[PDB]
Amino acid sequence: NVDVPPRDAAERVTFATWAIVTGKSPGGIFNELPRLDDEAAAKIAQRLSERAEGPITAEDVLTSSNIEALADKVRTYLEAG
Ligand SMILES: [Zn+2]
Ligand SMILES: [Zn+2]
Structure with missing residues (x-):
């Protein structure tokens, strides 16, 4: 099995935001995500x-x-913007 990098704007911003806030890359778009505390989840969401x-x-994040x-x-x- 191989990591799938983000494919569009939505995936890139989501992938990057997760990595930036937690300090660890999700690896790929299908990888299971680690559990977050509520502060990290709130920051990603904001x-x-x-x-x-x-x-x-x-x-939504959790x-x-x-x-x-x-x-x-x-x-x-x-797409609704
Ligand atoms: Zn989908
Ligand atoms: Zn990997």
Whole structure:
């Protein structure tokens, strides 16, 4: 199995935001994500909300299995902008 890098704007910003806040890259868009504390989840959510210009919550971040899933939420906002 091989890591899949981010494919579009939504995946790149989501992947990068996760890595920046936690200090560790998710590896790829399908990799299982490590568990976060609520502060890291809130920061990721705030940053994604600002960039996507739509509401992304700490719960959205916490319930995402991988970056692809979280980026899907971000993508819905980018295409509606
Ligand atoms: Zn890897
Ligand atoms: Zn998808």
